[PDB]
Amino acid sequence: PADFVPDSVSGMFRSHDFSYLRLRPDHASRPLWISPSDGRIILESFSPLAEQAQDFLVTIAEPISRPSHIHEYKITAYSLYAAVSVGLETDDIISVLDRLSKVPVAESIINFIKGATISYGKVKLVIKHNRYFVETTQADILQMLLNDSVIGPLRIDSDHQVQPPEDVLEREEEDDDIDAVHSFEIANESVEVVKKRCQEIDYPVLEEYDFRNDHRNPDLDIDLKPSTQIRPYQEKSLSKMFGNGRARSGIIVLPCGAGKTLVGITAACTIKKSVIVLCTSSVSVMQWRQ
Amino acid sequence: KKRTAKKNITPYQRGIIRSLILTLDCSEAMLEKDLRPNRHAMIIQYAIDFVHEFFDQNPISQMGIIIMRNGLAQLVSQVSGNPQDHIDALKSIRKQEPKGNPSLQNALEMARGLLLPVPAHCTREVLIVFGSLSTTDPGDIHQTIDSLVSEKIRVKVLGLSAQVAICKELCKATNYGDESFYKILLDETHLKELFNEAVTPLPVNKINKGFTLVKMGFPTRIFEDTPTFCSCHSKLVYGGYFCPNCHSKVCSLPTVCPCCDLMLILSTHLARSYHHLMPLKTFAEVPTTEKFRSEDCFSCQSRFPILKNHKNGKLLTSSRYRCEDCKQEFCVDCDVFIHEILHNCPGCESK
Amino acid sequence: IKPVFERFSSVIITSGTISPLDMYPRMLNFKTVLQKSYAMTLAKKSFLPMIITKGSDQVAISSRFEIRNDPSIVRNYGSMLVEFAKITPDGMVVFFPSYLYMESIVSMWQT
Numbered sequence A: 001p002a003d004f005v006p007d008s009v010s011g012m013f014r015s016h017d018f019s020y021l022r023l024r025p026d027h028a029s030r031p032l033w034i035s036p037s038d039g040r041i042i043l044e045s046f047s048p049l050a051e052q053a054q055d056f057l058v059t060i061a062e063p064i065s066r067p068s069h070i071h072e073y074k075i076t077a078y079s080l081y082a083a084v085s086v087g088l089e090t091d092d093i094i095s096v097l098d099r100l101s102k103v104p105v106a107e108s109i110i111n112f113i114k115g116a117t118i119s120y121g122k123v124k125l126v127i128k129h130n131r132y133f134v135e136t137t138q139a140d141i142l143q144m145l146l147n148d149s150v151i152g153p154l155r156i157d158s159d160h161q162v163q164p165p166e167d168v169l170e171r172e173e174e175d176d177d178i179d180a181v182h183s184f185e186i187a188n189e190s191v192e193v194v195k196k197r198c199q200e201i202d203y204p205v206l207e208e209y210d211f212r213n214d215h216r217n218p219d220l221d222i223d224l225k226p227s228t229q230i231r232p233y234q235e236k237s238l239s240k241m242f243g244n245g246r247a248r249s250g251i252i253v254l255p256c257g258a259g260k261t262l263v264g265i266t267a268a269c270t271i272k273k274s275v276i277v278l279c280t281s282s283v284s285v286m287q288w289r290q
Numbered sequence B: 001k002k003r004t005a006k007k008n009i010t011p012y013q014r015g016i017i018r019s020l021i022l023t024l025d026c027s028e029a030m031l032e033k034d035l036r037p038n039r040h041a042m043i044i045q046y047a048i049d050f051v052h053e054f055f056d057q058n059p060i061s062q063m064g065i066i067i068m069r070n071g072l073a074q075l076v077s078q079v080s081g082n083p084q085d086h087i088d089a090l091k092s093i094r095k096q097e098p099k100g101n102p103s104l105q106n107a108l109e110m111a112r113g114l115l116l117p118v119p120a121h122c123t124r125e126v127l128i129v130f131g132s133l134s135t136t137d138p139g140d141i142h143q144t145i146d147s148l149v150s151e152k153i154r155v156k157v158l159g160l161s162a163q164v165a166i167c168k169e170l171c172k173a174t175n176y177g178d179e180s181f182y183k184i185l186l187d188e189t190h191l192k193e194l195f196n197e198a199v200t201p202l203p204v205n206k207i208n209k210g211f212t213l214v215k216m217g218f219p220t221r222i223f224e225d226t227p228t229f230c231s232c233h234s235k236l237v238y239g240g241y242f243c244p245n246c247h248s249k250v251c252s253l254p255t256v257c258p259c260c261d262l263m264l265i266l267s268t269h270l271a272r273s274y275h276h277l278m279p280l281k282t283f284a285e286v287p288t289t290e291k292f293r294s295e296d297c298f299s300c301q302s303r304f305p306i307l308k309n310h311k312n313g314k315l316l317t318s319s320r321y322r323c324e325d326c327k328q329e330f331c332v333d334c335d336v337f338i339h340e341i342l343h344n345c346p347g348c349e350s351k
Numbered sequence C: 001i002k003p004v005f006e007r008f009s010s011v012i013i014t015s016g017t018i019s020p021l022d023m024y025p026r027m028l029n030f031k032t033v034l035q036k037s038y039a040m041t042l043a044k045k046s047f048l049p050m051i052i053t054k055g056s057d058q059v060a061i062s063s064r065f066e067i068r069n070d071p072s073i074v075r076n077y078g079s080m081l082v083e084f085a086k087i088t089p090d091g092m093v094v095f096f097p098s099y100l101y102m103e104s105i106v107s108m109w110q111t
C-alpha cells in the first residue's frame, strides 16, 4: 500500500498495572497526573499551567475527559502526527509534562513522544530550483534523502534546477517538504514509490504543495474570490492545512452540511491549478453544488 | 513583607447619610468573554452583593439603579430605602441581555435629575460601573460635568480593563480635584474588594460645608395581631410600628413616615454609623525578636506564636500583630476579625 | 549647512530621535565634542514597543512587496487594526509608509 497505518493507529496506549508501575515521585507535588500506561492525563485543579498543558495534550494526543475537577488523556496516531507538526520542543514538552503531571513519564509513552517530536510530522524533503528533491533543512532529512531508494536512487545528483524543479520537480514531488536547502533534483516518474517507501519505513514528511512550481499545469480557469462563507473551524482548518507558504494535501474531518466544501474551494482557488471536486453521489454532488 | 495601610488621615468626617445611585452598564460591550460567565452576569451578581452590603452598612440611605442600554438610561429602581425592591429589580435585569452602546452622558443627566429631591444634609453620589471603552452622547459632556460639580455631586467609577480619559476627568472633576476615585480593576477578587470599599462613606478632606440638625423620631412596635392594618402599603399586616408624631402604622422599616414625613430609625442604624466614624488604630505587627510577650492569643486563645530558633522558620516572623493603645497581643485571625467585623478592640475595651 | 557651521561657533543639535549619532558628522562633515545619548530611567515599564511580524496566519508581512493589493496582507493588516480599535481606549494613530499606499489600502478596506 501507498499509505501508512500510523495515521489511523489511534486507540492504543491504555493499559497499566500496580506492581511494576511505581508511584511517581512527582505525584507528591504534581498539579496534574499524566497516566502513561492508560495514556490518561489527570490534570486536576492543582495544575496552574492547565491551559498550556491542555493545549500540549490536545496537540500530541486527544483529551478524552474534560471534567470539572480533572481532565483525561487519550492516544491518537493522527493526534500524534498533529502534535509532531505542532512544532513544540520534544524534550522541553516532556520535561514540562513530567513536572506538571504527578505520575512519572512512562518509558513507552516517552519514546513515542520523542519520536513524534522529531520524526512525527517532521520529515525532511529538500527541493532544488523550486521543485521536489531528496534533502532536508535538518541533518536527518538530508541523510534520509540520500539513503532514500526513490529520493536518492531516483534523484539526480544535480543539486537543483529551475526548469527541472518546475517541470519534473521519483515523479513531480509537489508534495515534498521545504525547498531551498541541501538537496538534489529528482526525476518525474514514480512519486508513488517515494510515498510507498515513506509510509513503509514510517517517514512522515512535512509535505507542502508548491502550486507555483507546478509549471506543467497551466493555471486553470479559477476565479480566486474568497467571498464564500468563512467559519471559525473552517478558517482555523485552512490555517492548519495551508501550512507554511505553499499549501499541502491533507486530511481534515469536517461537519458535513456545515459548509464542509468551503475550505476546499478556498484552497483550490489558492493553489490556482487544476482541481476537481468529489462529493458522495452525483445527486448529492448536484445538491451540494446548488 | 507586609501590605498594610500606613495611617488613616481623615478619621474626623464622613458622609454618614448617603444617596448613592448605582448605575450599571448593560450594553453590547458587556457581552465579551473575560469574566467567567461574561462581564455582565458576574457584574450583576456582585451588584446584588453590593446592594445587600451597602444597605446594611449605611442603613439610613437610599439608592436607585440605572442601566445603560441602547444609548438610553432607563431607571430600573426608583431611589428608595428598601433593599428588597432594588434586589428584585436586579434579579429581573439579570435575565435580560444587553444591547446598544453605553450613553454615559444620558445616564449622568438622568442621575442629576434624579437626586434633586435629596435634601442638603443628605449627601449625593453616583457609582458608574463603566464597562465599555466609548460613549455615545447626545450633547456636550463637559457641560454636564460642570452642572454636576455645580450641584455638589461626587462621582466614583469602576472601569473595566482599560482607562478612559473622559472618565478620569470626570472623577477628578467632581471630587474637589483630589483624584483617587477612578480605580479600575485587574482581577475578579480585586472587583469584590472594589465594591466592598465602595460600600463605606467617602471622605477626602471635606470643605467646610453646612452641617444641619435633622428632625427624626423613633417608633414603638405594635402588639395586636388580628388587627392587621397598614398605612404605608394599605394591606393587613399582623403588626408594625407607630410614628411617634404622625401616629400611624408603618410596615417594618427605617423608612420615612408616609403620613407626616419624618425619618424613622431605631438606633442600631446610628450604632452602625458610630462604628464608621471613629475606627481603631491599625494593629501593629510586633517585632519578631523584640517582642518577648505572652505566648497565646488575648481575645482568643491561639497557640500560633513562634517556634524559637528554626534556621529560616523562626527567622521569618512572629505572629504577634498587636494593637497599640491596649498594647496586648492578638493572633492574625483575631486581628483580621476585629478589624473586619466587630470594631470594639477586645483589650482596649478592658482597663 | 556649511555656511552656518562656518559662521557660528557654539551650536547644538538636539532631537528626541537622532540615531545613530555618527551619521550626522559623516554626512554634514562637521566637528563635534559631546555625542551623548540619554536613557529613560523609569521606575516602571511605561510603553510597549513590539514588532508584529506575523499576523494570525503566522505570515511575514510588510509594505515592501509593492504599492498594491495581496489580499493576504490586506486582511492581515485589517484584522490587526480592528482588534486594536477594540482594545485601546480613546486615541490611536497609524502611519502608513506612503500616501498612495494608504489610498489603495483604505479603498479596498472599505471594499
Ligand SMILES: [Zn+2]
Pocket (backbone or CB within 6 Å): B230, B231, B232, B233, B234, B235, B237, B250, B251
Ligand atoms: Zn405597609
Ligand SMILES: [Zn+2]
Pocket (backbone or CB within 6 Å): B243, B244, B245, B246, B247, B248, B257, B258, B259, B260, B261, B262
Ligand atoms: Zn408620621
Ligand SMILES: [Zn+2]
Pocket (backbone or CB within 6 Å): B297, B298, B299, B300, B301, B302, B330, B331, B333, B334
Ligand atoms: Zn486569637
Ligand SMILES: [Zn+2]
Pocket (backbone or CB within 6 Å): B323, B324, B325, B326, B327, B328, B345, B346, B347, B348, B349
Ligand atoms: Zn487595643
